[PDB]
Symmetry: C2
Subunit: 204 residues, 2 copies
């Protein structure tokens, strides 16, 4: 992945930071996948995440190809979701939808699923051929019993309006997050360790 | 804390970064108390950490009092340590000390204990009254199998010098930490969520 053209199919700054801190240089081409699938049409939440990440990356690969006629070597997609008692929580639409989210996470242990898709692209016969490997990572996260005192002061953050489930763990999330169990970078947005473990089995 | 002067008794920036990111402002006054507490004088490693945090905070309370004789209202002391199968790891001495720490932490699971002391002071009647509350938080942390010359590179960066166990949480872009179990702000240096839980207990 030194010589290979790598692009990242997300505009999330926290994913960029994780990958760039790891030494990987990549282009950032956010995906135009405005569509989002049906959650009930999947067996498991991480299945819905791995597919949403697949479509994000394939939208980027088929847009770069049919516009530059360049097939990027690798396209990376990712989708981070949250589940509470089975119900799937994506990212909020307005500030008080964060409340409806945050009020449900409160006092409870939930899962963070991030499905990743590594799309290897090659061009032949004016067609973009795609070989896509998918995987996911789960991290359990416990929220302390949250009063609405810290709830509104935490929606007034402006912080949760982009995150999955309406929360982060580093800035102001410290009062929210009692404990996490599993890959912690997966909570922040990208399961970096599992991602580097994957690549070596596709190559070797 | 709405009307009182707060003092933090440590020079580590990530402790300061955490608490100010929590919306609490204060003043940084490091402690002149060496961590020469005899470890055999304790039964548990967290008892040692709490006692060390107490003395650090108490020294700052005294020095700020034997100077101005206007006792700051609450002074916070913290001590973070790492344990690997009973062995206590603290801040490294040289680079060889920082190197051996991580390569023993290699691929193994260890415990991170941070002990916190909240010292309440009162000086109205020409003398210092100090009432302290101590507590700790433990997080288990597993490291991945990473080669020696690569974490010998992490030692050359200067990052291991100020950290318990000789590592921060974004070490090697985040590939040194495979998993965490517990509060992760406890790992970087300060158990904010537990500290907030305590602060409301001291009062109401």
């Amino acid at each position: 992945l030194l010589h290979k053209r790598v692009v990242l199919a997300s505009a999330s700054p926290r994913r960029q930071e994780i990958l760039s801190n790891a030494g990987l240089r990549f282009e950032v081409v956010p995906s135009k996948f405005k569509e989002k699938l049906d959650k009930a049409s999947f067996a498991t939440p991480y299945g819905y995440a791995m597919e949403t990440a697949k479509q994000k990356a394939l939208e980027v690969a088929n847009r770069l190809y049919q516009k530059d006629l360049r097939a990027p070597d690798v396209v990376i997609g990712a989708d981070t979701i949250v589940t509470v008692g089975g119900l799937i929580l994506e990212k909020p639409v307005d500030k008080q939808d964060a409340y409806r989210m945050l009020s449900r996470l409160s006092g409870r242990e939930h899962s963070v699923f991030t499905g990743v898709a590594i799309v290897h692209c090659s061009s032949k016969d004016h067609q973009l051929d795609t070989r896509v490997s998918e995987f996911y990572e789960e991290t359990k996260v416990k929220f302390s019993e949250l009063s609405e005192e810290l709830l509104w002061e935490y929606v007034h953050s402006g912080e949760p309006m982009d995150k999955a489930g309406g929360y982060g763990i580093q800035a102001l999330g410290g009062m929210l997050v009692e404990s996490v169990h599993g890959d912690f970078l997966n909570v922040v947005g990208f399961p970096l360790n599992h991602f580097c473990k994957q690549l070596v089995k596709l190559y070797y």
